[PDB]
Amino acid sequence: YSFKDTSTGHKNKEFVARIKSKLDQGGVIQDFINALDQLSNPELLFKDWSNDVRAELAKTPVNKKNIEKMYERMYAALGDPKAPGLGAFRRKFIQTFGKEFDKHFGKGGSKLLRMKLSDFNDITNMLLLKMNKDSKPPGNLKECSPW
């Protein structure tokens, strides 16, 4: 939702606030929505937000807000220590993309500056290849998916 502080936006967002309070007692349906989000998306997760970033990078540098909103996806997915879901191959991928991410793609998060040129598809491709090869199917006995 994206509507303003108007006399209707006030009462409508107040109605949203009361229904939002009415449901998921203890945040357990949100725990399912999270657990199956964060685990279940294979290596191919990278390919998706990467070409989304590719499309969004053709925009003017004022798109830095959307750039950050796209970085935070993968960040909450991978970079955050003890990330929600605690995936098995998720752990493997974040372990394989720690300092490697810091070197190239995020600079600790400070890559947000360089939105002028869109060549980064090269880094995307070189990552995506080597993760496609020697990739692992999610473990046939699912016990490596703790939630």
Side-chain angles (χ1 to χ4, degrees):
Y1 299 132
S2 61
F3 193 51
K4 242 67 187 175
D5 76 338
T6 67
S7 58
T8 55
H10 159 63
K11 58 175 64 79
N12 284 42
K13 198 172 183 183
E14 185 264 329
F15 189 80
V16 173
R18 62 176 300 288
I19 283 188
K20 181 176 166 65
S21 82
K22 236 75 183 73
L23 64 91
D24 190 15
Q25 201 81 351
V28 59
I29 305 170
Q30 190 280 336
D31 200 34
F32 172 91
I33 291 161
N34 183 79
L36 287 297
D37 180 10
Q38 289 273 109
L39 254 292
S40 308
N41 276 276
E43 195 294 319
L44 305 177
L45 184 61
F46 175 69
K47 204 263 281 191
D48 299 340
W49 66 270
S50 65
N51 57 326
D52 312 328
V53 167
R54 188 263 173 275
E56 297 292 341
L57 270 175
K59 287 180 182 291
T60 47
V62 298
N63 202 54
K64 64 194 297 282
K65 298 192 297 283
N66 178 223
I67 295 296
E68 192 166 32
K69 295 309 291 285
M70 210 71 206
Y71 286 169
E72 64 86 23
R73 284 208 197 170
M74 61 79 71
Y75 273 124
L78 281 299
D80 291 341
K82 304 177 186 292
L86 192 63
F89 63 92
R90 294 294 91 197
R91 175 54 69 88
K92 185 69 174 178
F93 278 116
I94 182 58
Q95 174 66 13
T96 57
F97 279 97
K99 302 294 301 295
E100 311 86 350
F101 172 79
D102 296 333
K103 282 282 184 179
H104 299 101
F105 207 82
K107 299 191 173 187
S110 303
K111 188 266 183 181
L112 176 66
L113 189 137
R114 207 64 176 195
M115 304 310 99
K116 66 172 60 178
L117 76 164
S118 194
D119 60 0
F120 314 120
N121 295 354
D122 291 331
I123 295 96
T124 73
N125 290 318
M126 61 79 71
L127 185 160
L128 175 62
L129 291 171
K130 62 168 52 72
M131 307 324 290
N132 284 338
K133 293 179 179 179
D134 212 9
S135 64
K136 299 296 295 181
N140 176 248
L141 281 72
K142 280 291 302 287
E143 186 160 34
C144 69
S145 289
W147 194 94

